[PDB]
């Protein structure tokens, strides 16, 4: 039953300047059936298939260099080394303002206790976290 299948959708906190902290947005509708947000990470409560996804927005006023490397990744940690599940790399520069989105999505086999994270490499360029478009979610199929 879909009611029993866990779900989690967290969104970046905009007031946490300089980093990418996840917050549940007081989601009392997302019937998390075990999934928890601990240490900025999602912990899987059950073994099975899960849809893991995440999106980040980057923003910059002008190009200082030409080697602006923005990356977004999703990792898994089981027995307390992290393993990358999904990753992406963008380079917007070759003061004109710019933006670059990075969405990640995939289906993976998880076991109970896994700890999923979604990390970036330039939290300074993170922006638009108040529109709900910077997110990180889990759906048990």
């Amino acid at each position: 039953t879909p009611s029993d299948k866990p779900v989690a959708h967290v969104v970046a906190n905009p007031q946490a300047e300089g980093q990418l902290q996840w917050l549940n947005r007081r989601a009392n509708a997302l019937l998390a059936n075990g999934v928890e947000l601990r240490d900025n990470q999602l912990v899987v409560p059950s073994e099975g298939l899960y849809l893991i996804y995440s999106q980040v927005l980057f923003k910059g006023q002008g190009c200082p260099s030409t080697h602006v490397l923005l990356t977004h990744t999703i990792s898994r940690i089981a027995v307390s080394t992290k393993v990358n599940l999904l990753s992406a790399i963008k380079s917007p520069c070759q003061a004109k303002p710019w933006y670059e989105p990075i969405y990640l999505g995939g289906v993976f086999q998880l076991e109970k206790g896994d700890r999923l994270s979604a990390e970036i490499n330039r939290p300074d360029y993170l922006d638009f976290a108040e529109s709900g478009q910077v997110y990180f979610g889990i759906i048990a199929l």
Binding site: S3, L30, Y103, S131, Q133, I139
Partner: peptide, 29 residues
Amino acid sequence: XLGWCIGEAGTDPNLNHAQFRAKILXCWX
């Protein structure tokens, strides 16, 4: 396309558990 859709979905405050699933796997349709 998918990206902006999941985001929008995540913000709808009058969406049930059942409904949020449906529209995520909707976006992913």
